[PDB]
Structure formats: C-alpha cells, structure tokens
Amino acid sequence: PANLLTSLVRAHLDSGPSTAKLDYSKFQELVLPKEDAGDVQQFYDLLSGSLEVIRKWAEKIPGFAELSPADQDLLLESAFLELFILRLAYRSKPGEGKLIFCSGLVLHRLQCARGFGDWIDSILAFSRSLHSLLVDVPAFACLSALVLITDRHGLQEPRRVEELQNRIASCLKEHVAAVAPQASCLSRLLGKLPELRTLCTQGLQRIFYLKLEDLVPPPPIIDKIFMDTLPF
Template sequence: GVRQVQHGPDQQRGDDAQHVQQFYELLTRSMEVIRGWAQKVPGFSSLPKHDQDLLFYSSFLELFVLRLSYRSCPEEGRLVFCDGSVWPRLRCLRGFGDWVDSIFEFSSSLQRMNLDLSTFSCVCSLALLTERLGLEAPGRVEELHKRLVGCVKEVSGGRLSALLERLRELRRLCVRGLQRIFYLKLEDLVPPPAVVDKLFLDTLPF
C-alpha cells in the first residue's frame, strides 16, 4: 500500500498542474483574440509599435475580464470564454483562485447595466486606449481616449460616470488577477507561457 500513499499527492499535483495549464491556455487564446480585436480599434494600429504593445499588455487582463463578464452567466455560476468553452465555477477555482468570485461579482454588476453591444465596444476601447506609464506618444493616446469618452457619453444614455466607475473597479480587480498569476508562477507547477510572463514585465504595479 506504500505506493498508493505516495501516489496521492503526486496525482493531486498532476491534476493541479493540468488545471493551471488550462488556465494559462485560456489566457493565451484570449490574448490572440483580443490582439486581433485591438488592431481594429480606430486609431490603435496607427500608434507606434511600442505603444501598441504597452497598451495591449497593460490592458489585457482588464479586457479579458470585461469580455468574460459580458458574455458569462454569473447567476448560473458559469464563465463563457472567448473560444466558446463554458466552465462552471469549480473548474475555474484551481487556476483562478478566489479571483474567480470577484469576476462573478463584476459580471453581475456589469450585466445589470444592460449595455448594448455598441456601448460595450466603446467601453472596451476605452480600457485599451488609456494613459499608461512609458508611452512614446501619450498625446495621441489621450486624444483617442477623449474621443472615446465622447463616444461613450453619446451611446450610454447618461451613464458615463457609472461606466467610468466600473472601469476603475475593473482595474482594482485586475491587480488581484496579476497577484494570482504571480502566485501560480511562484508555485511553479507549470511554467507560464512567455506571453503571460510578459504581463508582469510590462505591468507589475506592486
């Protein structure tokens, strides 16, 4: 029976590693989708390459959570990812940790706003095109940001300040997401893909 005893934690470690691996794969696939989307945001692809990368990596987790929150079913306890896969809360726990519950809360509050697609698209663009440290063309980014605020004002029916508050909330939420990924990195069950690693190098706020 000794072998079985040894098998326990190893088996558990293997399962954990698989969950973490799936979590990283979700992030990586979402990155590809969101990068494709970002290229189509008016004005984004005309910015210096350095700024495009900086804006993309700085806002990636925010956009990941925003899009996830918009399409998920928080009241049913399910998250719907950009590749169409649907995960119940329990399946998310090992990778996301308690960050997942904050995402569900955010998703519920976002969905209560009943945003139509055009308002939601403007809000996503606003999360992408916002001032970040180290931009080469901060003036151009600020100009695009102002234009988007105008767009949100127009389409959101007087809910601009509520939406900006949601974005501030989102930023706080994503610091927790970074901390979670940092924890997984330290735990070292699975090495993070290079693109996920890059999130840290570019955006570590703490």
C-alpha cells in the first residue's frame, strides 16, 4: 500500500497516452466561422472511446476483480461519467483551451463546444481548479479509484466495496502525509468528489438534450448508462 499505491499508479499510467503518443493532426484553435450531426457524432465517439479504457483500468485496481460481477458492472456504469470528466480534466491544459482525450487526440475547446455545449466550459473550470491543487500522480491514482469504488444503490456486497474504498483512502492519506504526521490538503482533495458529481449531472443534461433533438442516436452502451443511472 505500498504495493497498493504502486499498482494504482501503474494502472493509471497505462490507461492514457504517452506525451509521445499525443495526436495534434486535428487540432485547430480557429474554427471557421446550433450543433450539427458531425459535432454530435464526435461527442458520442469521444465518450465511447473512454469506456473500454476505463473498464481495463478498473480491472487493474487490486480487489476490483474480486467484487461480484454484478457489483463491478454497477460501479463502472455509475462512475463512467465522473471518471471521463475527472481523467479529462487532469489530462487537459485549460490555460490553453486544450482538451486531451484518452486516445491521445488533442482538440481545442472551440472544436468541442458545439457537441458538448456549455458542459465543456464547466469541465475546463473544474480542470483549472484541479490543476491549482497540484495533485501528484499517486494522489490522482487513488482519487480516481475512489470515484469508482464507492457506495451505490443496488450493490450486492456494499461492505466489501466499503472495505476496498477504505483501503484506497488509507493508502491516499498515507501518501499525502508522507509527501508533506499530516489533511487540510486531503480534505481539499476529497472536496473535488462532490463537485465532480455535479458535473456528471451536467453531462446527463447534455445527453438528454441531444436525445431530445435526435440528430444522431447515442451508441447503445452510452444510452444504457444514461437510462440506468437515471434515478426515475
């Protein structure tokens, strides 16, 4: 934990692009001059691309594959939006308006604005605030795991999810104490989780709006996540 910390950092670093793998071939800060089908389809494709990456990342968190398969799927589905946002916010460069996606694709905020709507600006504000905390890679590797491994309604073994969460939280608390015994830093960090939930709602609102408009249908897996996480 110890070894837990190292496994978390490794899972985190293998789930995203190397700086050498960054792809700038579509990046344009100048967009010439309401959303259309190509904007909506790119929104859905960026969302979809993270899905398979996040699922592989989760399998590398020690103890996750030892949860029931029904609990794994519920935890993944429920956290998907928040993880997409958190990992995007941490990878991106909000000073420059640059969004960096898990494939390595780099886009300017103005290239995403029509598909994402105002949500992309909220994400970039959360990204600037995340960056001011100067969260180091091991701290991030625990925070993101804590977003996934958390209480959700319908869990078969809620105490086992809580034990794994406590292990990760303890691992984080120890790392933040060691790099600085002691928790104000820690409380500032954990304070990002509620804001993240609020941003996930904004994403659900954007997906609802696009489903209403109906230019291009959501891909089935995103659509199921949207429908499965609607508490009505």
